[PDB]
Design a binder for this molecule. Structure first.
Ligand SMILES: O[C@H]1[C@H](O)[C@@H](O)OC[C@@H]1O
Ligand SMILES: O[C@H]1[C@H](O)[C@@H](O)OC[C@@H]1O
Ligand SMILES: O[C@H]1[C@H](O)[C@@H](O)OC[C@@H]1O
Ligand SMILES: O[C@H]1[C@H](O)[C@@H](O)OC[C@@H]1O
Ligand SMILES: O[C@H]1[C@H](O)[C@@H](O)OC[C@@H]1O
Ligand SMILES: O[C@H]1[C@H](O)[C@@H](O)OC[C@@H]1O
Ligand SMILES: O[C@H]1[C@H](O)[C@@H](O)OC[C@@H]1O
Ligand SMILES: O[C@H]1[C@H](O)[C@@H](O)OC[C@@H]1O
Ligand SMILES: [Ca+2]
Ligand SMILES: [Ca+2]
Ligand SMILES: [Ca+2]
Ligand SMILES: [Ca+2]
Ligand SMILES: [Ca+2]
Ligand SMILES: [Ca+2]
Ligand SMILES: [Ca+2]
Ligand SMILES: [Ca+2]
Lengths: 384, 384, 384, 384
């Protein structure tokens, strides 16, 4: 279960570089130079790395320092063959963003958020990124009177439209991917789920430039089914990128390594990504637990890729098994894929077998055989 | 705090008529004749009533029985002055819908679900309903292999498109409102939140014919903020109807009376509905607890309306209070409502005050004053 | 992975016999005669069956009918070799228990609950049960003023003490096991978790006669860690029985088959039961989904046992693997098992290495190596 | 609604002194000198303040610095009349406690945790504290193999027993109060709820020296009912202290000001504390949101006390209202408080009215009248 470049495994600098500070605790690890992270990730088999502006160039850097940080990072990419498929802006750490970046009540802060984002889009394009993620972690509120949500959505649409106008004006090919999160750090965050983000994009001036970047743990923090949400994003043609990790139910964002947390949902997620032919990066946005030292960081990163590969094998074995294919037919998954009334409305209205002469009791008595199907899925996942 | 017709308070026959059966218990109340419910609700001050096909006409009724049930119900509406603003189809009780109505794996069941829905749309229009709700409570799954979600969304779009074609073909003015629910009775339900439902409608052939019918307790079962979701529905122009009740967090659907459950969210919800000028029915979809007898049913129904009216008074007093208006300005809610960059992209890019000369520390130091604002909101809610 | 009698797999009559009625749906399966269930379960490899009074003898049965129902059930046990290790009372279905059995506000109902329980304890002992479960599903409230909790705990202690006095007076060897549940059907249920139940037992007159019957899905409905709760019950010497099933997080009680839901928690649970040498029944309290017909019921029941057996194999392989034993030492699990200060308080107070000369930085720098350990656990669970 | 000394309102130095750092953000406020916090809290009407060792004396302080910090703090207490009723140890911030203090796998860390705790107990007693809180925020795990829970409970009992032996040996009158939390910062924390903590105390060598310090938001993070848990702690005689704040359901620990979050549960909590005659500190363990500046910190602290006082008034008005007293009788709360069978077991067994001649249907038909009672409670809370 060894990673290959074709696996398109990527990691954020902030994942393996997380120093272990939490709401109740100081750092447990020293900061990592991005150069070292790129070298270690490449040795593990990763194919790419992603960054926030402030992960790559320390906030408040001079132009000379900025150029030096980029130069060293570019050298590490060149030394390893690593790609930079995606970048994003830090609009959450600095205290100025305490009430948001794009939807801050203070208009001067909203303007500043856009200028900081635009500067980094230019850098992202220079490093070859195809996707630019927006995670509005500070957009939201802890109390009802603090944020009029319709006004905040107007400000959020305004900002995304300006960014769309900027990329179009520069002839860039980069597309945006909005990453939903339901809460944390704000009490409630705006566009809290993949559904809210999909609905919002359809009101933007150039919707084609935007998609979603769903994260396993985020949808799970709302107790939602992550593979279902990904299916709806795929159905919309909007799965531009994805963040893989684990989460143990409704609680704070744990960012466990992928495979940890809800193992069965990880299995059905990989089954769906592979069956649907998702072709973007398989990006891990996780945090090696603060209990770990540097050796445990790299073990945790390797485990993300290993788990994806084991799950890929088992889901492929499941779908290819003739006994599973027979069970899928027994459960009528083939009939779910056939149109309900390709004959048309009038034909349906005149079809007595659809109503007047439909034997509801006979239909009701037919078992769905879903448990047998699911135990074949469990046996394949466990290699039983 | 006495209801008036202008309050547009409505109730489902199945709410006050709920007999108290739960997963672990038999009925605690006798069935109510819809005629009696219409009479009692009208005496409490309600203005309208809603129904599923099977609440008004027992499933499997002959045409003569159907006509008789409707005749008596029409007489009660006429005797009381009560309206029927909304109706819906029962696509969840009968065992034939065990795997769904519109998204059942069995194609014959999907066709039957549409024929049952169409028959009731005709009746709804005859009774004067303006909104027809779809609640796909059986659409979903308990296991991963049982339902391919992209195929189910294709079947769901197909069904909604056929229904849109049917209402258009009859020249009806009725519009549809899809009611999201994240789970229960299925392990996970398709279109689980207001966001997913809004995003789905934008892929339908005639999106203008569809909106949402969000329910307080449903969004709260995903731990989401209900007033935020309603704000996004309003922002989209899609709040066609609403279901009001209470819920105590993430657990089974409690359907408490409105005002119970999360009282502060009820306050901010009524504040938003009234400020936004929502003009549809204020419909209660709740269940008087099974501990209650018939007298407690009517007390619970009256309490729904009373609570809405007390909250309406307190939210109006809050928004009208000059001290609150000053606090809103102190927290910059006025600046949230002003465009970020009406000057345009190029002007923003050339504005040094937005970046090069923006004093982030001075901006960061400015408190938002949200706690003072929220304690004024608490004082108004409590009449302190 | 075929069950043997030594596996002590048991099932409630109400599990495979569940007819599929839910809050929104009618039965999807015909009732099962307990005789048929005992025969089918025995054919699958189960070793025992459990019952509520009302599952075995229909509520309101005459003495002759009661004797006949018992006679046929005894014949089926004799025909199959099946055991009856545990029984319990239905104090939740009948409307008289709408506000509780032992803690009903109506005193006449509390007395009746005790008389109904006592009658069935006599029957349980006659059928050979060693454990009598109490699940106070109706003990609790939907509103604050409805139940004074200190008074309800007094009534609950009174009832358990009377039951303890009754078994002691008859010379029975049967012991009680209280099954916690946090909510559903009541908004909040009294003794909501294994901790609350353990604490309550320590205030009973004969605490030795009571233990707990924790259920996987119940603790998970509070988002608690089920193996941790079982560890605390074991630590207390109070794990008298256990209910095995699956649950997908915080939501209504799903009662999926064991292995479904949180698969990693099922793995750590079986690892703990086996390592601790738990010797009671491995009882499944689950509901085959209502999508299923009779064939799917038996497939679901078989899957419960299969999953327990696969997890038993993988956890045993994990603990026996020398590489895992080395990792456990690397993570200091051996040092967790050694007393902190067997040298005593004064020796600790005078030990400069414990404070004055303790190098906190050197200790802090040592990684815990938990991720490597956990990926060995994942590899064993998946057979990778 | 102005605080008085008799209200016993207290606050932790770390509450109003919280600098606003979160998992995704830097500090938004400068550190406060404890002297200033004591002065400001006293001006607001608080009566006492509490501390962790490391809030009062910076970690790694020399003896001279330690004495100076204490001297200035003692001067501020003397200048204001403020009390120090409770203290606790910081066993979570420093990286050495990354795997716990008392239950760290590393034995040297467990010894160090006890020595750090003992040093601060001496200081707490010198400052007049009556209660010493233990919050084992780092005791727990993110993965199954990392912590054997029975061994960790042995180590936890060992540590508490040594602390009990230490206070007894010094003749101190101080008692301990264990504060449960279900998760955060560890994936799952040991003794996750008030029930688990109560059960654990009953296994300690001197149980009389230990009680609980429940926190509103903590029990709510498990979706549990906080007033119910407090009722069980009161029933056990173990409510030694309490932490008051708000929380909006199951998610990360928000620590909102008291009254925010679940307002109805705050009402029933204050009703219970006052009716039961709880006589310990009404301590606020909350964090003014990081959106706020210093003025908003003091507004938030004042709001905690104001809300407690408004709720105290409304709950007292509720219990004193003759119409509410009549409703309580109508709902049989008086019968809940009467023994079920003071006549004894044999009298119950021979009482035909308890079984043979009990009319279950007549009893079942009696409504509980809980909705009318609850709407009187809502009307009192809102002053309607
Ligand atoms: O993906 C986002 C992540 O979830 C957050 O924690 O940091 C910003 C990243 O863009
Ligand atoms: O028993 C069921 C079978 O498993 C399924 O495949 O077809 C319907 C039948 O009723
Ligand atoms: O609004 C829906 C309700 O939530 C459900 O329980 O019954 C169908 C109704 O249409
Ligand atoms: O103190 C703050 C004030 O409350 C707000 O209104 O303006 C910013 C100031 O910094
Ligand atoms: O174990 C209990 C189960 O969880 C409940 O649903 O039925 C009573 C059983 O005793
Ligand atoms: O690297 C760590 C190792 O994995 C563990 O076993 O001992 C502490 C070391 O610091
Ligand atoms: O009460 C505890 C609080 O909940 C935690 O966050 O800090 C330690 C305090 O002792
Ligand atoms: O209607 C009910 C009344 O409200 C209660 O107080 O007594 C039982 C009666 O049945
Ligand atoms: Ca995350
Ligand atoms: Ca992410
Ligand atoms: Ca509902
Ligand atoms: Ca509804
Ligand atoms: Ca259950
Ligand atoms: Ca059970
Ligand atoms: Ca807290
Ligand atoms: Ca606390």
């Amino acid at each position: 279960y060894q990673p290959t470049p074709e696996d398109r495994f990527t990691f954020g600098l902030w994942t393996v570089g997380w120093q272990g500070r939490d709401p109740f605790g100081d750092a447990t690890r020293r900061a990592l130079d991005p150069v070292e992270s790129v070298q270690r990730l490449a040795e593990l088999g990763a194919h790419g790395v992603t960054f926030h502006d402030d992960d790559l160039i320390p906030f408040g850097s001079s132009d000379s320092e900025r150029e030096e940080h980029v130069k060293r990072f570019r050298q590490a990419l060149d030394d390893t063959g690593m790609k930079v498929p995606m970048a994003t802006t830090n609009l959450f750490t600095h205290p100025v963003f305490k009430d948001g970046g794009f939807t801050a009540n203070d208009r001067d802060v909203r303007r500043y958020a856009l200028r900081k984002t635009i500067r980094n889009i230019d850098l992202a394009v220079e490093l070859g990124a195809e996707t630019y993620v927006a995670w509005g972690g500070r957009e939201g509120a802890e109390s009802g009177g603090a944020k009029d949500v319709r006004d905040a959505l107007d400000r959020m649409k305004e900002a995304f439209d300006l960014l769309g106008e900027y990329v179009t004006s520069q002839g860039y090919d980069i597309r945006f991917a909005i990453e939903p999160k339901p809460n944390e750090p704000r009490g409630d965050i705006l566009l809290p789920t993949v559904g809210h983000a999909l609905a919002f994009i359809e009101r933007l001036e150039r919707p084609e430039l935007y998609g979603v970047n769903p994260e396993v743990g985020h949808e799970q923090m709302a107790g939602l089914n992550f593979p279902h949400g990904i299916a709806q994003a795929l159905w919309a043609g909007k799965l531009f990128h994805i963040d893989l990790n684990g989460q143990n139910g409704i609680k704070y964002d744990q960012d466990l390594r992928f495979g940890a947390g809800d193992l069965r949902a990880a299995f059905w997620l990989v089954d769906l990504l592979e069956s649907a032919g998702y072709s973007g990066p398989r990006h891990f946005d996780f945090k090696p637990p603060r209990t770990e030292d540097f050796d445990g960081v790299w073990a945790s990163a390797a485990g993300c890729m290993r788990n994806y590969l084991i799950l890929k094998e088992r889901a492929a074995a499941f779908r290819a098994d003739p006994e599973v294919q027979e069970a899928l037919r027994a459960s009528r998954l083939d009939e779910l894929a056939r149109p309900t009334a390709a004959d048309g409305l009038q034909a349906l209205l005149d079809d007595r077998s659809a109503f007047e002469e439909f034997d509801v009791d006979a239909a009701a008595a037919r078992g769905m055989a879903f448990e047998r199907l699911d135990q074949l899925a469990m046996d394949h996942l466990l290699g039983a």
